[PDB]
Design a protein around this ligand. Structure first.
Ligand SMILES: Nc1nc2c(ncn2[C@@H]2O[C@H](COP(=O)(O)OP(=O)(O)O)[C@@H](O)[C@H]2O)c(=O)[nH]1
Lengths: 426, 49
C-alpha cells in the first residue's frame, strides 16, 4: 500500500543511499543482484513500502539519486549493493556546485530539476498511493544543500499534504571542511524551516563522538558514520513494514513531536552501540537501553540536552519485549529527570513497538526528541555567519548569479527568531 | 536454345553483375525485443581506487 519515496542529494546523499539500502536489504534478505533469500513471511508482506516489483521477481529501490557531478555516482554503482538501484533514477550533472550554495540552488539547480522531478513524478504517481517523502542530504555542501532544498520546495508545492521527512547533516564546528561553511547552512535553513514537516539533525562531530567514546573504534571511516545513521533512520520507520503491539508510522511521529508547526527539529539516536569489549558483558534489557540512550554520548547532534529542556520526546522500541518496562522506564525518566522536561506538557514522550528487532540484536530502540537544545546549535552557526557576512567575505561568489543583499538579510532574520522562539519554551 | 526442353524457363544458369562492392549492411543494435543489444562498453569515470 503506502510507499516511502527516498530522495538522496549531494555526495553525502548518494553515499547514505548506498548504506541505508544495504541495511534495508539486510532486514529484507535482498540479494545484491536483486532477488530475495531468507524464507520468512514478514519481510515481503510489506515490501512495497520501499521496493517495487519489477516483473522479473527482483525488487528495485524507490530511491532518487541526485548530484551535480558524476564521480560520486560511479563510486556507489561500483560498490556492493550498487546494482540494486535503477540506472534511470540516477541523474547526472556535469558542471557541479563547488561548495557554493547560490550556484547549487539557482542556475545549476534549474537545468537538472526539470528532469529529476520528472523522475520523482514518474515513480510516485506510478504507485497507487503515497505515505510521504524522505530526503537525505547535507546542508554544508553545494549540490545537496543548494538544489536538494529546491526539490523539497517544489514537491511540497505540488504535493502539500504528504509528509516531509528529511535527514540533514549539518556543519561541524570543530572540524571545518567546506571553508565557506555557515553560508551554506544559513541559506538552506531559512527555507527548510517553513517548508518541511520533520527535520532530523545529524552532525559529523557527534558521530565521531559516538565512534570514539561508546563504540571504541580506532579508525572510524565515513563508512562507519554512514552505517550509524542507517541504524537510526531504519528504526524510525520500522513499523511501516513490520507489525507490532503499539504501531507508529512517520505521521504518528509528526503529530506528537510538534507542538507548533514552525518548530520541528529533533535529536536522533540509536541504541545499543558498544564494542566487542563490552558486547558480551552487558544485559540487553529495557532499562539498559534507555539509560544508555538518555545522555549526551549517544545523540547524533553536538548539543547537550542537559543545557536545555526536552519539549517532546518519542522512544520507539524494537523486538520481543514486555510492555510494562516500556512505560515504566519512560515514566521513570520523568520522575528522576523532572527538570529536563517541560512543565506545560504532561507525559512528554510517545511509545511504539516494532515486533521485529534489527539483524543480530534481540532488542533495540530509536529516539526522536524535540528539545530546545537545537537552539544552541543555531547560535553556534550564526556567530560564524555574521562574523564573515559583516566583512563582506566570499560574497562575490554569492551575488554574481542571481541573489541580492535582501535575501541574505532575510536568512538570519528567519533563523534568529527561530532562536528567540526556542527561548520562550525554555 | 537458352530455354528449357519442355516449358519456358531459362536453362543456361544466369550471369550476375553487382553494382558496388556491397558492404555496410548496417547491422542494427536493437533486437526484436529492443533492449540495446549490449556489448561490453567503456566507463568514462575516475580511477576506481
Ligand atoms: N555524514 C556524512 N557526512 C559526510 C560524508 N561525506 C562527506 N560528508 C560531509 O560533507 C561535507 C562535504 O560536502 P559535499 O557533499 O562534498 O558537497 P556537495 O557534494 O556539493 O553536496 C564535508 O564537510 C563532510 O564533513 C558522509 O559519508 N557522511
Amino acid at each position: 500500500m503506502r510507499e516511502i519515496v527516498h530522495v538522496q542529494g549531494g555526495q553525502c546523499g548518494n553515499q547514505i543511499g548506498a548504506k541505508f539500502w544495504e541495511v534495508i536489504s539486510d532486514e529484507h534478505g535482498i540479494d545484491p543482484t536483486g532477488t530475495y533469500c531468507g524464507d520468512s513471511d514478514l519481510q515481503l508482506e510489506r515490501i512495497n513500502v520501499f521496493y517495487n516489483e519489477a516483473t522479473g521477481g527482483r525488487f528495485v529501490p524507490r530511491a532518487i539519486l541526485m548530484d551535480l557531478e558524476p564521480g560520486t555516482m560511479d563510486s556507489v554503482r561500483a560498490g556492493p549493493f550498487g546494482q540494486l538501484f535503477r540506472p534511470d533514477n540516477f541523474v547526472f550533472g556535469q558542471t557541479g556546485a563547488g561548495n557554493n550554495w547560490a550556484k547549487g540552488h539557482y542556475t545549476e539547480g534549474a537545468e537538472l530539476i526539470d528532469s529529476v522531478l520528472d523522475v520523482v513524478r514518474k515513480e510516485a504517481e506510478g504507485c497507487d498511493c503515497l505515505q510521504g517523502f524522505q530526503i537525505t542530504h547535507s546542508l554544508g555542501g553545494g549540490t545537496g544543500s543548494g538544489m536538494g532544498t529546491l526539490l523539497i520546495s517544489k514537491v511540497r508545492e505540488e504535493y502539500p499534504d504528504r509528509i516531509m521527512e528529511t535527514f540533514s547533516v549539518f556543519p561541524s564546528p570543530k572540524v571545518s571542511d567546506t571553508v565557506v561553511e555557515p553560508y551554506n547552512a544559513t541559506l538552506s535553513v531559512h527555507q527548510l524551516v517553513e517548508n518541511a514537516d520533520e527535520v532530523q539533525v545529524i552532525d559529523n562531530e557527534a558521530l565521531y563522538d559516538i565512534c570514539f567514546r561508546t563504540l571504541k573504534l580506532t579508525t572510524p571511516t565515513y563508512g562507519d558514520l554512514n552505517h550509524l545513521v542507517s541504524a537510526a533512520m531504519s528504526g524510525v520507520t520500522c513499523c511501516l513494514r513490520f507489525p507490532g503491539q503499539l504501531n507508529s508510522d512517520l505521521r504518528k511521529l509528526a503529530v506528537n513531536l510538534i507542538p507548533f508547526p514552525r518548530l520541528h527539529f529533533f535529536l536522533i539516536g540509536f541504541a545499543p552501540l558498544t564494542s566487542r569489549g563490552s558486547q558480551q558483558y552487558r544485559a540487553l534489557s529495557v532499562p539498559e537501553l534507555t539509560q544508555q540512550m538518555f545522555d549526551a554520548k549517544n545523540m547524533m547532534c553536538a548539543s547537550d540536552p542537559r543545557h536545555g529542556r526536552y519539549l517532546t520526546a518519542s522512544a520507539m522500541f524494537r523486538g520481543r519485549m514486555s510492555t510494562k518496562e516500556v512505560d515504566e522506564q519512560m515514566l521513570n525518566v520523568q520522575n528522576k529527570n523532572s527538570s529536563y522536561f517541560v512543565e506545560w506538557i504532561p507525559n512528554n514522550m510517545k511509545s511504539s513497538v516494532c515486533d521485529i528487532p534489527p539483524k543480530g540484536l534481540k532488542m533495540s530502540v530509536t529516539f526522536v526528541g524535540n528539545s530546545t537544545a537545537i537552539q544552541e546549535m543555531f547560535k553556534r552557526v550564526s556567530d560564524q555567519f555574521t562574523a564573515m557576512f559583516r566583512r563582506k567575505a566570499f560574497l562575490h561568489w554569492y551575488t554574481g548569479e542571481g541573489m541580492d543583499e535582501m535575501e541574505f538579510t532575510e536568512a538570519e532574520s528567519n533563523m534568529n527568531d527561530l532562536v528567540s522562539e526556542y527561548q520562550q519554551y525554555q | 536454345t537458352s530455354l528449357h526442353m519442355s516449358k519456358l524457363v531459362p536453362v543456361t544458369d544466369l550471369s550476375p553483375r553487382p553494382s558496388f562492392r556491397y558492404h555496410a549492411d548496417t547491422g542494427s543494435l536493437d533486437a526484436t525485443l529492443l533492449p540495446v543489444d549490449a556489448v561490453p562498453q567503456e566507463r568514462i569515470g575516475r580511477r576506481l581506487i
